[PDB]
């Protein structure tokens with residue numbers, strides 16, 4: 001078995017190997033990349049996502065989210081307080097202000113230490129989940145606005161045509177903005193490109209060990225666990241690397257820099273934080289190997305997780321027994 005320790009793998013495709021997206025994902029899996037839950041892909045030196053980022057300031061962040069923490073430094077939840085709309089140029093100025101800017105630091109490890117020590121004492125503002133794309137239409141390779149859709153993959157594998165569309169989302173971050181422990185909707189893959197700015201640090205649990213993370217989470221967030229049998233779908237819980245190590249949970253970490261892609265694999269729990277002002281683009285995708293994960297994905301039916309239009313067909317076709325209860329939670 002390839003990659004039996006479930007290490008995060010880093011790939012350097014040539015421009016020739018960068019032509020066929022599906023083929024390269026399948027290659028990475030042939031080398032065991034999925035066992036980690038996360039891989040990094042450094043694009044060939046000839047590739048670019050677009051010519052410049054000089055003209056993005058007028059994008060609107062209609063609902064910036066202030067991420068308010070509760071708990072202890074290594075075990076906390078966050079809630080999202082909606083703020084008034086602002087442009088990307090306004091948000092960048094705010095990220096660089098004395099109140100919100102990255103502190104002085106020696107290196108990524110020192111900054112990681114400072115994040116886990118001090119995150120809970122601040123409430124950074126995240127421009128998350130904005131429908132749109134920064135890939136130039138003329139970028140032919142790994143253009144996250146031109147990937148094959150999940151509905152087309154399901155139809156190709158299973159023969160059933162379904163409603164729904166599959167589009168990318170932009171994330172404008174600042175120091176200490178945080179993504180909570182989660183897997184993707186329906187345990188899909190995700191791909192994330194860091195277009196510009198400061199880094200993003202990721203933590204990930206191998207898919208074969210995801211249930212160990214879930215059992216710890218139920219212990220650490222006992223009221224939330226009684227409320228819902230899949231409360232990690234709410235995307236609000238944080239657990240530090242130190243707490244994971246104390247509880248013997250297998251995980252890995254890596255820092256993504258501007259110009260690099262990350263892929264998360266089905267049922268790969270992940271969490272992380274931004275180092276300073278940045279912009280990422282991400283989308284979900286599927287492969288033939290996903291179908292079995294989609295059929296077994298947990299679901300929130302308490303009402304909290306509330307998701308997209310396109311998830312309805314996935315539940316309805318892959319999980320018909322769960323459909324009625326899940327839909328009640330959606331409505």
Ligand SMILES: O=C(O)CNC(=O)C(=O)O
Pocket residue numbers: 128171178179190191192264270280282283
């Ligand atoms: O970048 C973020 O805030 C969160 N991204 C992801 O969870 C992802 O790309 O799957």
Ligand SMILES: [Mg+2]
Pocket residue numbers: 055056057058059
């Ligand atoms: Mg603009």
Ligand code: NI
Pocket residue numbers: 182183184190264270
């Ligand atoms: Ni994700």
Ligand SMILES: [Zn+2]
Pocket residue numbers: 227228229230231233234300301302303304305
């Ligand atoms: Zn729930």
